[PDB]
Design a protein around this ligand. Sequence first.
Ligand SMILES: O=Cc1cc(Cc2ccccc2Cl)cc([N+](=O)[O-])c1O
Ligand SMILES: [Mn+2]
Length: 181
Amino acid sequence: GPLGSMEDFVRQCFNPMIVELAEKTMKEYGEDLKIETNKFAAICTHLEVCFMYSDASKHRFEIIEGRDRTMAWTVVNSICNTTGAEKPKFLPDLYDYKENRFIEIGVTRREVHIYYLEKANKIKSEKTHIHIFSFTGEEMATKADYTLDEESRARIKTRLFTIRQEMASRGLWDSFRQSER
Ligand SMILES: O=Cc1cc(Cc2ccccc2Cl)cc([N+](=O)[O-])c1O
Ligand SMILES: [Mn+2]
């Protein structure tokens, strides 16, 4: 049918705060949202998932993702100096004060196991916990430890489904799904 604009969709369906943060991210990494619209959408999605993940248990998680890079690294350094946790080589999305480990969160259109393996290879850290969500409800987590209960993760998955099917409703899904990497 009628093909829609990804930028319009992103601005209509994501919270304005999230949008601003995503724009800030893309500016920071030199990417133009006006052209890299799928990347823009993905960054919004990943941000929202990180925030929902944090929100599932307030006072447990420090949020790293969303801050400017220097600020984020400052926070990471602070957490390491305060808790004695090993410094990660790449910027994680969260810190878990309860389990005393950083959390890397992935959101993928690809096969979750493969994606997980790529992440676990590309962090080269050992204590950082990895949690991968797909748009079809699949999950993959380090040591099969999923951290949050089924209801919280169900909320996350449901949001992902909503996004996927509104995109599909606008004819955006086909392009978005294969523009990964
Ligand atoms: O897909 C977008 C995306 C964005 C981010 C945000 C981000 C975090 C750190 C550096 C650059 C960027 Cl774009 C992170 C991940 N990730 O960890 O799977 C992402 O998959
Ligand atoms: Mn990150």
